[PDB]
Design a binder for these strands. Structure first.
Lengths: 63, 63, 63, 63, 63, 63
DNA sequence: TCCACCGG
DNA sequence: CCGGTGGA
C-alpha cells in the first residue's frame, strides 16, 4: 500500500521487465521521497548496491 | 527460523561479510534442501540471478 | 606477528607495491590457512570485496 | 572517539550499509576537517583510492 | 645494459610508440624474468599499476 | 633535493597516498615553477599524460 | 553521463 | 555471455 509517485516508478520498472529486489522496496518505504525523480534515483542507487553485493565472491574453506 | 544446514551456509556468508537479499532467503525456505552443498549452490545461483537483474538497464521516459 | 606463509604472500604484494587494506589483514589472521596458494586466493577474494564495496555509490539527500 | 561532523557522515555511510575500510578512518582522524562537506569529499576521495588500489593486478611468478 | 629478451620486448613497445615509465624499468631489472612472455606479462601488469595510480584523485585542502 | 613549494605539493600527494612516477619528478625539476598552484597543475597534467600512455594498447607478434 | 567495443 | 574500459 504505497505512495502514488512510488507506484508510478515501480511500474516503469515493470514496463522494462525488471524485478526490483524486496529489500529495496522495504528501504524505499521508510523514506517518503517526494518527486518521481527522487524515487528513480534512490532505486537506481540501490540496484547498484545489490549488483555489487551479489558479485562479491564467496571464500570457500569447505566447497 | 531455519534448518541446521541452512544456518550453516548463511553463517559462511556472514563470516565473509556478504548480505544475502531477502528474496533469496524466501525462495530458500520453500525448498528444504538436504545438504549444505545444495543450499550453497542454490544461493549462488540466486546471487547470479540478481546480479544480472540489478544490472538490467532501465528505459526512462524521464530523468 | 603471523604465519610464515602469510608473510610469504604479503611480501609478494609488497614487491608489486600494492597496499593491502588492513581489514583484509584482520580477516586473514582469523583463518589459519595452510598453503600459500590458499592465502593468496583468500586475499584476492578480499580485494574484489573491497573493490566492490568502495564502488557503492552514496545517496545524497543533503549535498 | 571522534568529531561531531565526522560522526554525522560515517552514519550516512552506515545508513547506506557501506563499510568504510579502516585505513580510511585512520586517515580521516589525521585532518580534523571542519564541515561535513569536507569530510564527505575527503572520504569519497579515499574510496576511489582503494577501489583503484584493490583493482591493481598482482604479478604471479609462482602459482 | 639489459637482458636480451628484456631488450626484445621493450623494442616491441617502441614500434607501438609507447613510453614505459622509468619506474617500471627499475622494477623490471630486479627480477631477471626468463622468457619474453613473462617480461611482457610483468610489464603489462606494471602499466595497469600506473594507469591506476595516476588516476587516483588528489584531495585539495587549499587549492 | 628541491624547491620548498615543490616539496609542499609533493607532500600533498603523500598525505593522499599517491606515488608520483619518477619521470614526473624529473621533468618537474627542469622547470623551476614558482607557486604551488603552478607545480600541482603541472604534476596533474603529467599524471594524465601517463594515465593515457600506460593505457595505450600493445600490438603483440607474441600473444 | 551514456553508448559502444574488446577482453576474460 | 558478462563484465570492464574507453570514447563521444
Amino acid at each position: 500500500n504505497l505512495s502514488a509517485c512510488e507506484v508510478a516508478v515501480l511500474d516503469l520498472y515493470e514496463q522494462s521487465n525488471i524485478r526490483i529486489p524486496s529489500d529495496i522496496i522495504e528501504d524505499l518505504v521508510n523514506q517518503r521521497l517526494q518527486s518521481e525523480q527522487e524515487v528513480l534515483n534512490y532505486i537506481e542507487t540501490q540496484r547498484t548496491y545489490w549488483k555489487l553485493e551479489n558479485q562479491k565472491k564467496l571464500y570457500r574453506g569447505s566447497l
